[PDB]
Amino acid sequence: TGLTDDEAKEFHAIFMQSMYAWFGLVVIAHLLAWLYRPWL
Amino acid sequence: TGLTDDEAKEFHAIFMQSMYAWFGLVVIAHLLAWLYRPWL
Amino acid sequence: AMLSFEKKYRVRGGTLIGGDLFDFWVGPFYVGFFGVVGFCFTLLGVLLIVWGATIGPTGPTSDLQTYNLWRISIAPPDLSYGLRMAPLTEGGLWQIITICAAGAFISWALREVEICRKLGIGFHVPFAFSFAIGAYLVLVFVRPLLMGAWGHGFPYGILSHLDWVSNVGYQFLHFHYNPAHMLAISFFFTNCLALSMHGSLILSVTNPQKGEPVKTSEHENTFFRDIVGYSIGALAIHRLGLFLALSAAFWSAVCILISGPFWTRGWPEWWNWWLELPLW
Amino acid sequence: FTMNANLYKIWLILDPRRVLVSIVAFQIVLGLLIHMIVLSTDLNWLDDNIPVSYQALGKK
Amino acid sequence: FTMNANLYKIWLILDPRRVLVSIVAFQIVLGLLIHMIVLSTDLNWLDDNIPVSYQALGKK
Amino acid sequence: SVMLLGCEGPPPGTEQIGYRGVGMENYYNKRQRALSIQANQPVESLPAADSTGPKASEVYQNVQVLKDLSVGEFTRTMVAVTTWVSPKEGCNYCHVPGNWASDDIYTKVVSRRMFELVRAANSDWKAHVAETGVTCYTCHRGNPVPKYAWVTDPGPKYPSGLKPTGQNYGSKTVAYASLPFDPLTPFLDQANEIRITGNAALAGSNPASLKQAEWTFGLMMNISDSLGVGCTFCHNTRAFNDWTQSTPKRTTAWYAIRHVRDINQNYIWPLNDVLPASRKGPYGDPLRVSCMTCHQAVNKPLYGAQMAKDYPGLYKT
Amino acid sequence: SAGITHYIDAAQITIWAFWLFFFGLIIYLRREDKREGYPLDSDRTERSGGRVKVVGFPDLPDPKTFVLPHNGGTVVAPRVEAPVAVNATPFSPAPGSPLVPNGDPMLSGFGPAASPDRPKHCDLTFEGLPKIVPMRVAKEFSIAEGDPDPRGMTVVGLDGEVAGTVSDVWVDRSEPQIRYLEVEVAANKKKVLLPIGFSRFDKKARKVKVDAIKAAHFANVPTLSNPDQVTLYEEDKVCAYYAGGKLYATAERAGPLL
Amino acid sequence: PEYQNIFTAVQVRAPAYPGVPLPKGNLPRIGRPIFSYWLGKIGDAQIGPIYLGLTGTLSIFFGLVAISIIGFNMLASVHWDVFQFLKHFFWLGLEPPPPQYGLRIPPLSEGGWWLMAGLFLTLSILLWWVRTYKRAEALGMSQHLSWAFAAAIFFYLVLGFIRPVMMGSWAKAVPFGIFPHLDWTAAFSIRYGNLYYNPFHMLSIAFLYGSALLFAMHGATILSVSRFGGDREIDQITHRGTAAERAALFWRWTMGFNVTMESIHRWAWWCAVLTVITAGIGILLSGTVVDNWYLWAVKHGMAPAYPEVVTAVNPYET
Numbered sequence A, B: 001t002g003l004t005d006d007e008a009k010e011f012h013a014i015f016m017q018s019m020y021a022w023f024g025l026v027v028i029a030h031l032l033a034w035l036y037r038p039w040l
Numbered sequence C: 001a002m003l004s005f006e007k008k009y010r011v012r013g014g015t016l017i018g019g020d021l022f023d024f025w026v027g028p029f030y031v032g033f034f035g036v037v038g039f040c041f042t043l044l045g046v047l048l049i050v051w052g053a054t055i056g057p058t059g060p061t062s063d064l065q066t067y068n069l070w071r072i073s074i075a076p077p078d079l080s081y082g083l084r085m086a087p088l089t090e091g092g093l094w095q096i097i098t099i100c101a102a103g104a105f106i107s108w109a110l111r112e113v114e115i116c117r118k119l120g121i122g123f124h125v126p127f128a129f130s131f132a133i134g135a136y137l138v139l140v141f142v143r144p145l146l147m148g149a150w151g152h153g154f155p156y157g158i159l160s161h162l163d164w165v166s167n168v169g170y171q172f173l174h175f176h177y178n179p180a181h182m183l184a185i186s187f188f189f190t191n192c193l194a195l196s197m198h199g200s201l202i203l204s205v206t207n208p209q210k211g212e213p214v215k216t217s218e219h220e221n222t223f224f225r226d227i228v229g230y231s232i233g234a235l236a237i238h239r240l241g242l243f244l245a246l247s248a249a250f251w252s253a254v255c256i257l258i259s260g261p262f263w264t265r266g267w268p269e270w271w272n273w274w275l276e277l278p279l280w
Numbered sequence D, E: 001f002t003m004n005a006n007l008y009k010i011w012l013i014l015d016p017r018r019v020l021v022s023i024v025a026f027q028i029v030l031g032l033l034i035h036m037i038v039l040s041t042d043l044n045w046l047d048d049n050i051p052v053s054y055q056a057l058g059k060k
Numbered sequence F: 001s002v003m004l005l006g007c008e009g010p011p012p013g014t015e016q017i018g019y020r021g022v023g024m025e026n027y028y029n030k031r032q033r034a035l036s037i038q039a040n041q042p043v044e045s046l047p048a049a050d051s052t053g054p055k056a057s058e059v060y061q062n063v064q065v066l067k068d069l070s071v072g073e074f075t076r077t078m079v080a081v082t083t084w085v086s087p088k089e090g091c092n093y094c095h096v097p098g099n100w101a102s103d104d105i106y107t108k109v110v111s112r113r114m115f116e117l118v119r120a121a122n123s124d125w126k127a128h129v130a131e132t133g134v135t136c137y138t139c140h141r142g143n144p145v146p147k148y149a150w151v152t153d154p155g156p157k158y159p160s161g162l163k164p165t166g167q168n169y170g171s172k173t174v175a176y177a178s179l180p181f182d183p184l185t186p187f188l189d190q191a192n193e194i195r196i197t198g199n200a201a202l203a204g205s206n207p208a209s210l211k212q213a214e215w216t217f218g219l220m221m222n223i224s225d226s227l228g229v230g231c232t233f234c235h236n237t238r239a240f241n242d243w244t245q246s247t248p249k250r251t252t253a254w255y256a257i258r259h260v261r262d263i264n265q266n267y268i269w270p271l272n273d274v275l276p277a278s279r280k281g282p283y284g285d286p287l288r289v290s291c292m293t294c295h296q297a298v299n300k301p302l303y304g305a306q307m308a309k310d311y312p313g314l315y316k317t
Numbered sequence G: 001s002a003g004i005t006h007y008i009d010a011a012q013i014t015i016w017a018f019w020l021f022f023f024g025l026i027i028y029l030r031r032e033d034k035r036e037g038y039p040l041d042s043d044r045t046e047r048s049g050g051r052v053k054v055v056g057f058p059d060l061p062d063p064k065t066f067v068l069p070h071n072g073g074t075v076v077a078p079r080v081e082a083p084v085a086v087n088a089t090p091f092s093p094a095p096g097s098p099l100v101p102n103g104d105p106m107l108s109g110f111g112p113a114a115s116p117d118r119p120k121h122c123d124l125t126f127e128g129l130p131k132i133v134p135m136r137v138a139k140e141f142s143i144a145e146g147d148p149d150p151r152g153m154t155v156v157g158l159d160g161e162v163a164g165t166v167s168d169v170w171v172d173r174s175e176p177q178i179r180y181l182e183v184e185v186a187a188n189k190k191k192v193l194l195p196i197g198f199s200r201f202d203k204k205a206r207k208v209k210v211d212a213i214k215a216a217h218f219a220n221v222p223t224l225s226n227p228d229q230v231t232l233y234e235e236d237k238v239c240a241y242y243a244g245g246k247l248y249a250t251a252e253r254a255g256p257l258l
Numbered sequence H: 001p002e003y004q005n006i007f008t009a010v011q012v013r014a015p016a017y018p019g020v021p022l023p024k025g026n027l028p029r030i031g032r033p034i035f036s037y038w039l040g041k042i043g044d045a046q047i048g049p050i051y052l053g054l055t056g057t058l059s060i061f062f063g064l065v066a067i068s069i070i071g072f073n074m075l076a077s078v079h080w081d082v083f084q085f086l087k088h089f090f091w092l093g094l095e096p097p098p099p100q101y102g103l104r105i106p107p108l109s110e111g112g113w114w115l116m117a118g119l120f121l122t123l124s125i126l127l128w129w130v131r132t133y134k135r136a137e138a139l140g141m142s143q144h145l146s147w148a149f150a151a152a153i154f155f156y157l158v159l160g161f162i163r164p165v166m167m168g169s170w171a172k173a174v175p176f177g178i179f180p181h182l183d184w185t186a187a188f189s190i191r192y193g194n195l196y197y198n199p200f201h202m203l204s205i206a207f208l209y210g211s212a213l214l215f216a217m218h219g220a221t222i223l224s225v226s227r228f229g230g231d232r233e234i235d236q237i238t239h240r241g242t243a244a245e246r247a248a249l250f251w252r253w254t255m256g257f258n259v260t261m262e263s264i265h266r267w268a269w270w271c272a273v274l275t276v277i278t279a280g281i282g283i284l285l286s287g288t289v290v291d292n293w294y295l296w297a298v299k300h301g302m303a304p305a306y307p308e309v310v311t312a313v314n315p316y317e318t
């Protein structure tokens, strides 16, 4: 896939942390939403 | 499949443990779903 | 059996799925893995339409049961069932036959695809086919889903489905005013026009008056340029026709997609946005 | 109940990338399928509202 | 429930631009999707008239 | 743009009308259904009146309709007719001040006639009005002039050299369609023929014109719109004329059509000489009645609210 | 008695007439359908030594003659065509089995690479000048204002490698358009045709991609018996080669996927 | 990836073409050409010249007259308010003579403009017919178009003139307006008891669907064999190439049989002409022969029965 083995730990790192940040904003939204009007 | 006999040991390993991780997340979700709302 | 020039192309490989497993011909039809899935979907579909014809809406001995071809009809379940699977003898059958029809059309499309890979031709045909498959899906999958129940789908019967079209059409009072309907109808009519013009042309040049030789490209362009001051040219006319017919299918799909889910009022009323602009 | 495991050999016959995306796709679709099946049935969580149905918080 | 320290290799098999834009598409679609899922059920947040009815009582 | 344009969101409210697969179904906007319900709210009744007393015709001077009522009941009946027809104006709208028995103001000669109009309605038209019946509010809605009253209209202008298309215009009265824009005068005032379908497959015994078909189509668009529904509400479009395949609402609508012919012909046209120009169209014809007038886009005026049963003074004898 | 309803009305019998005219039409169209490829190839024919020429229903229509303009010839249909060996061998000896190309797949001239033997003459303008000729032979032609001139773009194959460069542009003298790209090949500076259908432009880069074959395969492009014109035989020959690469040019187009 | 032959990606120009030359008698050609880079984006960029003979001039002439009566009339219906004309245009129209008049030639203000516009339109369409036969002869070609145009003319004639004369009433022809003529269509089906049960209208519908099916299939094919110059259908018809071979084979391997580069053009040709010809027959029997198609379908047992779950009592029968 035209990457080096040196540049996929690098990519994997950025991918994982970014993905986790996204998941974080998601958890905030789901937390505010659960407070303002719990859905379960 | 242009893999070595060893890169079918490695891939198989990550495949299996990764998959087991998925099944794990699944047991987690199903557990929450059953406690809050048993379906059977 | 093969065409007198066919053996030289009947190569091995090109699949998507199956590989050498089903990589063979039967008579003139290509099988392939998707010919098998297709035949299975198809056969069960038809065999079930035969069983529905066998049982009838009130049982095999009642007067509504029938094997008359104009009248055999398999209809959806009531709306009360929503998106759930409904009992077999209450529209369940119709649901399964539908799953089989969608699966068969999709297998057929994928098998035309393996055939393009074998023959090495463009894949314009199965892509174009996929437009009819799409229209069929809106008429059984998308709309009835957006409408919270599978019963919004049309029944499978020669004239009864015509009746579906009729009363659904009439819930909007004057369907002709559906603007997407107006489009699709325009393409269906124009498509029918270009086709008659191309058809006529090819046949008018490769077979000209006795005393004349097969005609030329120069003739082709000169005739329609003579008549209407323009000729779109040979390649492109094949392009247009493909555009018209695929678009005609498109707009049929959208004109029905908006009739319910995105518009409930009569359709002529839609045109109000025009009489009320602040211009008049 | 025979003796050879060594079922890693499976990737010497089956292309890993394509198998990967195949499982991926199937999982998202099976996901949507199942979600639509339960949401259309009794175990429903949306057409309820906890602790009170919300458009019947005001009748007016 | 731990991280197989060679999971970076997933990027030797799956093309990064495609995985990325794919996630963006699937996510934006799901987003638009769910937003109208909820707006289409009892939990509506638009058609509530909060804190006061906004038109009037009619045309007046 | 070439804007885009006119649109509701999914999912619509839906109702199954005919048999599964026949396509006789109905779609509607849930939002707008709720707005129509708030706008089609009924006025609650006034407490029953005990009475127990003499009959109205014994204590009053000019009581030609609400005779057999007890005084109390008559008074109550007067309060309902007040809020129902002209509450911003009160009692004085139909009476000459200081003189309750006088007919020296037209709105009373009319009010009286409308007392016979509702009564005839509630007591003689149940195959149409059922047990919901009608009341002043039905048409008036706190208004002296039914907002949704009609008039025979002349359509848009024509030079002198040519005569009108009779159809072909943008009119909300034929559902925005181009059919003929006044399907009411010939059907809801006069009684011209609506039927055009033949009862024989082969021809030679049905003179219905295509034009007549279009008039029927226009009118039907009118009807549909007034009650706020589509043809599968009353018909099975494979056979518009087939009564066995129709819905019991076609029967009801049939009797309703005749009913509007009676309101318009023997209760409204006659009030034309005592009504002001302010209440008349370009031909001198007066504002009359249609289905919209009462239903105002709902299959049962005010979503089938039962108002009349509370005022016994609204029934014949 | 003035009511004897007849069960037969003009509508029935008009539906009858229609279906009869229909059947004759269908039949006829299927006859024009056998003006080529027929009689079919079975081992029914070979087993019987040929005593079962396969034609089916309906049958074959009497030949029709096309009189080509310009001292061109005369073609008939249906005709008797000389068999031609198959440059491949049966994947299985069972019938209906596909065949594997013999030798180097792009060279085989079998499969996506197969093609018939069209005349070894040229298609002609109305006047009779070689319809398809290069812009170097067709002086008048000219790029359309606002279109990158292909002349000078780099032709690049399926794997990335440069293939050659556009040395010219072939055009239709009958319906003015780019039909063929000319390619001065890198590996041997020989000039080859490249069908427009196989060529994608990358105007901002002045490249002309080609998914068909690899940069290298450009070395084996079938050749022209004259660099200032081309025959019908040669066109099929040129294109079919590239087409072969769609299934051959890689050890993966063969399919499967799973 | 691969060019799809949807959009000419790089064009070329050459001096315009006045065309193959016509014999003595066939008048000069007029106008001198131009190119549209954009038509060119998708097709022959050459625009014109055009041919105009006695025929062509008498047809353009009649046709524009007819267009004026319809239009002017529409402006009149809105009081010469070009604004209102613009506003309701879709709904504007010129209705036909009333029945009261039968087939008599009516007064200007009561339909006579329609009879004149109908008259002039028809003469102009049939003159364009003759035009295409002349333009088709000057080229030694055959009259395949003219046999189709003649079929569509057939439907037209059945709709606005033939059925009306047979029914003895100009009010039965179709009115000139967009929304008006849509309404005419619906009312037509309604008046004769639902046209869906008219066999001929079912066939015409199978044939309209078929023109879309065949042209989409064939057209997609020719593009898929565009790579081998399959668009060059003439020589693939005289001298079969691998385009016509791969083409016939795609379908052969798909649906079990196939046609040829020459014959597909006949299936397509015949399928289109059939639409209009079933179509016209369909309007011909309505009122002339059948008055209520649904009933007709019941008499021939073709209409399905469904359990009667909803029903209404007949007041006419009380």
Ligand code: BCL
Residues within 6 Å of the ligand: B025, B026, B027, B029, B030, B033, D024, D027, D028, D029, D031, D032, D038, D043, D045, E007, E010, E034
């Ligand atoms: C009664 C039903 C309950 C409920 C019961 C369940 C149950 C039970 C399950 C879910 C599961 C899912 N539910 Mg739910 N769920 C509820 C209502 C919702 C609602 C909503 C608007 O109400 C939403 C949006 C969802 C959505 C979700 C998805 C996040 C999730 C996985 C489905 C899928 O497609 O797999 C997509 C497949 C993938 C492979 C993507 C995996 C993504 C997840 C979130 C983890 C990311 C890992 C990432 C892919 C790492 C890749 C490696 C890197 C490339 C290196 N649920 C209702 C209330 N839901 C499933 C789940 O979460 O599994 C634990 C599951 O088992």
Ligand code: BCL
Residues within 6 Å of the ligand: C105, C132, C133, C134, C135, C136, C137, C139, C164, C165, C166, C167, C168, C169, C170, C174, C175, C176, C181, C184, C185, C188, C248, C249, C251, C252, C253, C255, C256, H185, H186
């Ligand atoms: C009822 C009165 C209303 C009206 C109501 C409707 C309604 C309602 C609808 C239409 C639809 C359409 N109408 Mg209408 N319509 C009106 C009047 C007209 C008029 C006219 C002159 O008056 C015309 C020309 C049309 C024409 C059209 C098209 C615009 C469109 C249908 C094409 C289509 O669906 O493609 C789609 C094509 C397909 C779905 C076929 C797909 C093929 C599948 C994949 C494979 C089939 C395989 C099968 C097994 C083949 C059998 C082979 C066996 C194996 C041998 N209508 C009247 C006024 N009309 C329909 C539409 O919009 O389309 C969705 C629709 O829902």
Ligand code: BCL
Residues within 6 Å of the ligand: C176, C181, C182, C183, C185, C186, C187, C188, C189, C190, C193, H156, H159, H174, H178, H179, H181, H182, H185
């Ligand atoms: C058989 C059923 C009815 C009827 C059924 C329908 C239905 C159903 C529909 C139409 C619609 C239309 N009909 Mg019709 N229509 C009738 C017979 C006619 C006749 C005629 C003299 O016989 C004409 C001119 C038309 C014309 C039109 C087209 C304007 C339009 C769709 C375009 C198309 O297919 O173009 C192919 C042909 C061309 C591209 C050639 C050139 C076009 C010429 C110049 C059009 C002239 C009129 C033009 C509208 C005026 C100015 C332009 C406007 C800005 C658009 N109809 C028949 C009698 N017709 C469709 C629509 O939506 O619009 C109402 C539609 O839904």
Ligand code: BCL
Residues within 6 Å of the ligand: C165, C189, H067, H121, H125, H152, H153, H155, H156, H159, H185, H186, H187, H188, H189, H194, H195, H196, H198, H200, H201, H204, H205, H206, H208, H275, H276, H278, H279, H280, H281, H282, H283
């Ligand atoms: C309204 C509800 C009725 C309906 C009533 C009718 C009626 C009535 C008719 C059709 C007609 C047809 N219907 Mg229908 N139709 C229905 C629903 C449908 C449906 C559907 C999915 O439901 C479909 C697919 C169809 C399909 C069709 C077509 C198959 C067919 C006409 C083909 C055509 O273009 O002729 C149109 C082509 C022409 C008229 C020729 C055009 C050439 C002319 C001469 C061009 C001149 C151009 C002009 C000079 C240019 C200058 C412009 C000037 C300004 C005028 N209908 C329902 C049941 N339908 C025909 C029919 O069936 O009759 C039996 C017809 O007349």
Ligand SMILES: CC[C@H]1c2cc3[nH]c4c(c3C)C(=O)[C@H](C(=O)OC)c4c3nc(cc4[nH]c(cc(n2)[C@@H]1C)c(C(C)=O)c4C)[C@@H](C)[C@@H]3CCC(=O)OC/C=C(\C)CCC[C@H](C)CCC[C@H](C)CCCC(C)C
Residues within 6 Å of the ligand: C038, C041, C042, C043, C044, C045, C046, C049, C097, C098, C100, C101, C102, C104, C105, C108, C109, C112, C125, C126, C128, C129, C130, C131, C132, C133, C155, C156, C157, C158, C161, C245, C246, C249, H209, H210, H212, H213, H216, H217, H220, H254, H255
């Ligand atoms: C999208 C633009 C146009 C188009 C294009 C199109 N259609 C196509 C193609 C293309 C390019 C093909 O290549 C493909 C083909 O094979 O060519 C004929 C196809 C096709 N066009 C066909 C149908 C078709 N296309 C239609 C229309 C259209 N298709 C548009 C006009 C129509 C209509 C309604 O006008 C029909 C009926 C098929 C003959 C063929 C695909 C055949 C196929 O997919 O076969 C596999 C399936 C079966 C053999 C049957 C499956 C068994 C089922 C379970 C039972 C049937 C269930 C069905 C839902 C019941 C409906 C009953 C009706 C009586 C109501």
Ligand SMILES: CC[C@H]1c2cc3[nH]c4c(c3C)C(=O)[C@H](C(=O)OC)c4c3nc(cc4[nH]c(cc(n2)[C@@H]1C)c(C(C)=O)c4C)[C@@H](C)[C@@H]3CCC(=O)OC/C=C(\C)CCC[C@H](C)CCC[C@H](C)CCCC(C)C
Residues within 6 Å of the ligand: C189, C190, C192, C193, C196, C197, C227, C228, H059, H060, H061, H062, H063, H064, H124, H125, H126, H128, H129, H132, H145, H146, H147, H148, H149, H150, H151, H152, H272, H273, H274, H275, H276
């Ligand atoms: C298989 C049946 C299909 C079919 C076939 C068909 N149609 C045809 C033909 C055929 C075979 C022709 O030969 C003919 C044609 O020319 O094809 C391109 C035609 C035709 N198809 C057309 C229309 C048409 N066909 C339709 C339908 C169909 N026809 C079916 C789909 C439809 C529909 C229902 O949608 C339409 C709208 C026309 C373009 C053409 C017939 C043209 C014609 O008869 O002309 C009459 C008169 C005029 C156009 C008046 C001229 C007005 C000029 C355009 C203005 C130019 C003015 C200029 C500036 C001069 C100066 C003016 C001075 C007076 C000041």
Ligand SMILES: CC(C)=CCC/C(C)=C/CC/C(C)=C\CC/C(C)=C\CC/C(C)=C/CC/C(C)=C/CC/C(C)=C/CC/C(C)=C/CC1=C(C)C(=O)c2ccccc2C1=O
Residues within 6 Å of the ligand: H214, H217, H218, H219, H221, H222, H243, H244, H247, H248, H249, H251, H252, H254, H255, H257, H258, H259, H260, H261, H264, H267
């Ligand atoms: C128990 C068990 C095992 C069951 C037994 C199985 C049984 C019952 C066996 C019976 C087998 C038989 C008899 C048939 C099999 C049936 C099959 C599978 C179904 C057929 C499905 C099929 C698609 C039929 C459709 C038929 C029709 C009319 C399709 C419409 C398309 C059309 C109008 C057809 C004719 C025109 C065609 C084919 C054009 C294609 C075509 C086009 C479009 C070109 O452009 C072109 C250009 C240059 C050269 C050639 C061509 C060309 O051939």
Ligand SMILES: COC1=C(OC)C(=O)C(C/C=C(\C)CC/C=C(\C)CC/C=C(\C)CC/C=C(\C)CC/C=C(\C)CC/C=C(\C)CC/C=C(\C)CCC=C(C)C)=C(C)C1=O
Residues within 6 Å of the ligand: C190, C193, C194, C197, C198, C199, C201, C202, C220, C221, C224, C230, C231, C232, C233, C234, C235, C237, C239, C240, C242, C243, C244, C246, C247, C250, H006
């Ligand atoms: C030898 O071959 C031949 C020639 O070559 C010599 C000829 O020149 C000729 C003569 C032919 C001509 C002169 C052609 C004339 C063309 C006619 C009559 C067709 C009329 C069409 C129009 C007036 C155009 C109508 C359409 C528009 C104005 C654009 C509309 C745009 C819209 C609706 C929005 C765009 C978006 C969509 C439609 C939605 C998405 C679209 C799709 C999904 C369709 C996909 C299409 C493709 C192509 C892949 C013939 C007959 C011939 O056979």
Ligand SMILES: COC(C)(C)C/C=C/C(C)=C/C=C/C(C)=C/C=C/C(C)=C/C=C\C=C(C)\C=C\C=C(C)\C=C\C=C(C)\C=C\CC(C)(C)OC
Residues within 6 Å of the ligand: H067, H068, H070, H071, H072, H075, H105, H115, H117, H118, H119, H120, H122, H123, H156, H157, H159, H160, H161, H173, H174, H175, H176, H177, H178, H181
């Ligand atoms: C402001 O505008 C200016 C430019 C003046 C002009 C504008 C004009 C415009 C915009 C006009 C617009 C016109 C439109 C949109 C017209 C639309 C017409 C449509 C859609 C018509 C659809 C169907 C019509 C049909 C089928 C009509 C059929 C009529 C026929 C066949 C009539 C036949 C009559 C004959 C042959 C007459 C015979 C007369 C005899 C000789 C018998 O008398 C003795």
Ligand code: HEM
Residues within 6 Å of the ligand: F059, F060, F061, F062, F063, F064, F065, F066, F067, F078, F079, F081, F082, F083, F085, F086, F090, F091, F092, F093, F094, F095, F100, F101, F102, F107, F108, F109, F110, F111, F112, F113, F115
């Ligand atoms: C609260 C306000 C009102 C009061 C107190 C009231 C009171 C009365 C009284 C006492 C009578 C009997 C007078 C007599 O004939 O001797 C009467 C008759 C009548 N009033 Fe009213 N009125 C009121 C409002 C209205 C309104 C609003 C209308 C019309 C919309 C109306 C229409 C009539 C008519 C038509 C009569 C004659 C009744 C008949 O012939 O049966 N009144 N009113």
Ligand code: HEM
Residues within 6 Å of the ligand: C170, C173, C174, F194, F195, F196, F197, F198, F216, F217, F220, F221, F223, F224, F227, F229, F230, F231, F233, F234, F235, F240, F241, F249, F250, F251, F253, F254, H190
């Ligand atoms: C917009 C689509 C509609 C169309 C095209 C339509 C068409 C027709 C037609 C053609 C007839 C006459 C049948 C014949 O010729 O014998 C008819 C009759 C009738 N329709 Fe409608 N209709 C529509 C909507 C409605 C609605 C919504 C109602 C009721 C609310 C309704 C109520 C009636 C009644 C009661 C009759 C019988 C009237 C009589 O016979 O005097 N229709 N309709």
Ligand SMILES: [Fe+3]
Residues within 6 Å of the ligand: C198, C202, C238, H218, H222, H233
């Ligand atoms: Fe073609």
Ligand SMILES: [Sr+2]
Residues within 6 Å of the ligand: C060, C061, C062, C065
């Ligand atoms: Sr039985």
Ligand SMILES: [Sr+2]
Residues within 6 Å of the ligand: C276, C277, C278, C280
């Ligand atoms: Sr305004």
Ligand SMILES: [Sr+2]
Residues within 6 Å of the ligand: D054, D055, D057, E042, E043, E044, E045, E048
């Ligand atoms: Sr709420």
Ligand SMILES: [Sr+2]
Residues within 6 Å of the ligand: E053, E054, E055, E056
């Ligand atoms: Sr507001």
